[PDB]
C-alpha cells in the first residue's frame, strides 16, 4: 500500500495509481464520483452530490464515457477516432480525474481544471490528448478533468419545467468545480488558485462559468481555446430549445411532465438515433442540444452579458488555431473530403456558404460570398476551397473570439490572445486542412515529451514552451516567464492595440488585429443587415 | 491677301480662314482658333439642338480664342492658381460654339492622325481655351493635328423637359457631335486624316467620349477613344428623364417661370439668372454631383449607359482608360465639413460619417454604414489621418475608380481592346496641398506636354515624363496601341483583360504592370451595393 496513493476526501477514502511520465512518476486518481449517477428518474435533472462511501474506493482507472453519438464518417481513421469514446458508454458517467506530482506537493499547488469540447454532443476526459501526467510531472501542476453530460442527456430542455430545466451538463461541470474547492487540498492542490481551461464547446463552457455568478466563486482565471459563449452555435433561445426537445419527443413516440416522463423511458440510443434530426437547416458547426438562455444559469444572452459585465478581477487567455473551419467541411459541404485536395467550383462555394452560414438570408449569404471571393482569382478552386474554410472558421470561432477578447478588455479584464500556427508532424488529416480545430491540444498537454509518439525534437521543445505559458498563466494570470528576460514578451490584448502572438516553432511574434477587417464584417455589418434587411 | 503669311490661309466649308503661327519650344506650329461650327445658340435657339454654321463672306480671323460658354465661375478660393486655372479665360457668352485646330507648321503634306479633345468640368463648366489644353506641344513634337471644341454646359447644354420639342435634352453632346461632323468634312483642309480620329477627354469630357461610343450616330465620326478619369456609367454622368424634368421644373420656378410655355419663359431669363440658381436643384447636399447633365432620353442614349455597356458589341473598339492616384481629394473642400486646402484636414470619426452621407448622397442609411465599415481601418478606427484619406478614397472610388473598373471590364468582355493606367505623379508645381496627392485633373498638363516649356519651371524628369506620355497617347491615336513598335527595350503596356486585369503605373519610373484595378473594393461598389439596393 503506497501512502502517496491513499487520499481521504469528504466522501471517503480513495486509492490512486502511480503512472510513469517520461521524466518520472506521477500520482493519478481516476474515476472519482462527484455526483449521484444521473440515471432513471434523474435523467435531464440537475446533478445531486455523491453520497459518501465505505472503505477504500478504487480510483486507478478511467470511468465510463457519458452516453453520446459516435462518429462514423471515417471508420478506423485516427483523425476522427482519436476523439471518439475510448471507454464504455454509460449514463452513469459523472466522475472526475486528478493528476498530481509524485510524491504529492509539499505546499499548496495551482490547479488547472480541463473542460473538454465536442459540440456539447460528445467528448470524454479519458482521451489520450487530455492526459494530465506531463503537466503534472514537468510543471508540478495539479490537473483535474471531469466528465459532464452531453447531447439530450446533458442539454435537452423544456424551459420552465421542473423535470428538464436545461443546462444540466453545465451544472455537472459546476458541481465538479465545487468538488475541487472542497477536496483538492487533500491532493496538495490550492483551492485559492484554480484556472479553468477548455477547447471548443469546453471553451464555450468556461465562458459560461465566467458569465454565471454562482460559478465565479469557484475559480480565478480562464483559458478559452477555440470557443466562446457568444457566437452562433454555443447557445439557443428558450423557444428554440423547446422546439427541438418537442420534435425529438415526437420522433421517438412521445404537458411537459408527461412528455419528459415518456422520454425517460426511452433507451439511451433511441434518443441519440434522432439527435441530428431536430436542427432547423442543413448545416455544419451546428449542434442540436446545447446550453440554453434560461434566465437562470444564463440570466441573459452571452452577447448581452459580455457587453454589460464587470470583469475587473479576471484574467483570461484566449485564442484560435490557424485553420478553425477546415475540419467541418467534410461533414456536410459537397466537394470536400479528407481523401483528395477538395478543389471546388464557384458554384460549390456558393452552395457551401448556405450550409456554413445556415442562418444567413439570401442577401447576407451574398455579402459573405462577395467579401470572401478573391476578385483577382474569383474561380480559382484553391482560393475557393480555402475561402470556404475561412468562412466557417471566422463565423464560428475567430470573430466570436475577437468579439469576446475586445469586450472583456474594454470592461476591465486582463486578456492575452494567441493564434496557434504549428501543424503536428504526425497529423493524419490532409495538408489542405492545415492546422485544424483541436490540434493544439496535444501540444498544450505535452504529449510530444513522450518519445514513443514520434514527434520531432523541435515539437518537444515547442510543447515545453506551451506548457510553460499555460502553467505560468495558471500561477500568475500572466503567461510570461517571471524570471527570464528576453524580448519579445507576450503583451496583453487591448481594444487600442489589439496585440496577440503567434504560437509556432519560431520565437513569439507580436501581431496587431485579429482578422480586424473581416471580423468587422461579421461582428458589425451582418448584424445591422439582418436587423434591417 | 498678298502681304500675309501664305502658310496660314485655309478654306473650310463655311469659307476662308486666317490662322496664326505660334511658337512652341522646338519650333513653330499653326493655330486656327475660334472657328464657328454652329449658328449661335441664342434667343429662340436656347436649349435647342445646334444648327450648322451658315457660310460667311471674306476671310474669318482665326487668330484668337472665342467666348467661353456661359457658366458658373468658382469662387471658393479667389486668387488661387489651383482653382483659377480651370476658370473661364475669355468672355462668357451663349454665343460660344467655336472650335480650335493646331497643326504642324508648315501644315502636314500627307494625311495626319487627328486627336479631338473634349474638356471636363462636371458638365457645368470648362473651355477649350484653357492653358492646360494647349495643343501646340502635341502638334510640334508629335506632328499631331489637334482639335478642341466648346460645347454648351449647365442649363444651356443640359436642361431637359424630355419628350419636348423645345428642350429635348443632351444638346451639349449634340454640340460635340456637330464638331465631330465638322472634322469629318473639313480637317483634310489642314492635313488631318478624317479616317483616323481619336477622341480624348477628362472627367465629364471622358464621360462624353463614352456617350459617343454608346450613341450610334457618333460612331461613324471617330475610330478610337481615350477616357481619362471619367465614364458614361456611374452615379454622376447621367440622370433619368424624370429627374431631369424635376430639376428643369424646379429651376423654372426658382427663376420665376405645358412645356412650351415653361421653356418660352426660361428663354426670356438672363443667362446669369439661370447660372445663379443651378446648384439649388440637386436633391441632396452632395459633392461630385451636378445639376444639368446628359439625360437618358431614349434618343442620344437609347438606354442607360449601364445597360448599353452590358449588352453592347465592342469588337471593333480600341480604348485607353485610366485614373489618377487621388480622384476624390479635390471635391472634399467643396462640401465636407472639416476639409480645407489651407490645413491638413485631419477629421474625426463623426466628420467621416457625415462626410460619407455627402459623398455618397443617394445611399440609404444601411448602405452608408456598409461604406463606413468597409473604409474604416479597424486597427485605427479613430485616426484622423486615415479618416481623411478614407474620405477621399470613398469619393474617388465611388465616382471614378470603380466606374472605370466596371467600364474596362465590360468593354473587354464584349470584344474591345482596352488599355488601362493609374497616373501617380504629383506635379512639382502643384499649388493644392500635399494631403490631396495627385488630384483629379492633374495628369492633363502632362499629356498635353506643358513641361516642355522651360518657362513653366517643371523639372527635367518631368519634361522626359511628359514626352513619354505624349508618345503613348499619340501611338494609341495612330495605331490603337500605346506601345512604340520600334522600342522593344522599353517595358510594354499589356491590354487589360478580365482574366489578367492588367494595367500600368504612369509615373517617373519605367512602366510597371499591376493587376486588379481596386478589385476587392470595386466588388463592393459594383456588385454588392447594387444587390443591396434591390431591397
Ligand atoms: C481646417 O479648415 C476647415 C475650414 O475652415 C477654414 O479654414 C480654417 C483654417 C479656418 O481659418 C476657418 O476660419 C476657415 O473657415 C475647418 O473646418 C477645420 O476645423 C480646420 N482644421 C483644423 C482643426 O485646424
Ligand atoms: C518660374 O520661376 C521663376 C524664378 O523664380 C519665377 O519668377 C516665375 O514666376 C516662375 N514661372 C512660373 C510659370 O510660375
Ligand atoms: C488515440 C489518439 O489520441 S491518436 C494519437 C495521436 N497523437 C499522438 C498525435 C495525439
Ligand atoms: C490510466 C491510463 O494510463 S490509460 C492509458 C493512457 N495512455 C494510452 C495515454 C498511456
Ligand atoms: C468537430 C467537432 O465538433 S468534434 C471534434 C473533436 N473536438 C471538437 C473536441 C476537437
Ligand atoms: C492658368 C494656368 O494654367 S496656371 C497652371 C500652370 N501649370 C499647369 C503649368 C502649373
Ligand atoms: C467638377 C470639377 O471637378 S471642376 C474642376 C476642373 N476639372 C474637373 C476640369 C479638372
Curated annotation (Swiss-Prot), chain B:
Its EC number is 3.1.1.7. SUPFAM superfamilies: alpha/beta-Hydrolases (SSF53474). Disulfide bonds join 69-96, 257-265, 402-522. It is a peripheral membrane protein. It is an enzyme of class 3 (hydrolase). Belongs to the type-B carboxylesterase/lipase family. Synapses usually contain asymmetric molecules of cholinesterase, with a collagen-like part disulfide-bonded to the catalytic part. A different, globular type of cholinesterase occurs on the outer surfaces of cell membranes, including those of erythrocytes. This is the catalytic subunit of an asymmetric or soluble form of ACHE. This is Acetylcholinesterase. It comes from Mus musculus (Mouse).
